[PDB]
Structure 1
């Protein structure tokens, strides 16, 4: 019945688990955040030199058979930070299940 999702705990400051986006699933670690309602991950279309882009897992639409193009710009303003990019549509797996 219920789906268990294991979380990692970094220094009691950040809790995150692994999800998948695409067919075949590409793995990303996300914060299951009850203080917000959007889902986002780094894109393959981010500047390689930008510290945040390079050090994290990037989503690549071309590797997915279930990807549906959207393209609408998005901007999110959290308590601690801001990010921008664009919208896309694909299947999300919980856990990743590669």
Structure 2
């Protein structure tokens, strides 16, 4: 079995490190059993998206296993919303970079 160390922030946020691409690009994610989709901030994110400024961004040009989809997505969580576009790549757990 693979152990994924989780970081605890104020008993409110539990997140662990993952990898997207070849070579893996590191990102911290919430392993949410209440949702069924994987998403990370894109490098092609809007300048208006401030959250993007202080968070890791996926760059498809730096990955060799990246497969383009392009299909637009729209997620609505109780707390917030996000939209973007679909992509396909290799997901490493833990990061392994």
Give the TM-score taking structure 1 as reference length.
0.96
C-alpha separation between the residues in 2 aligned to 1:29 and 1:51? 18
**Partner deviation per Cα, 1:42-69 (whole Å, 9 max, x = no partner):** 0000124532111100000000000000
Segments of 5+ residues of structure 2 without an aligned counterpart are none
How many equivalent residue pairs? 97
Structure 1 vs Structure 2 CA RMSD = 0.8
The answer for unaligned runs of 5 or more in structure 1 is none
Q: Secondary structure of 1:53's match?
A: helix
Give the ranges of 4+ consecutive aligned residues of structure 1 lying more than 4 Å apart after TM superposition: none
Report which stretch shifted further, 45-54 or 13-22.
45-54
1:25 & 1:67 partners in 2: Cα distance?
11
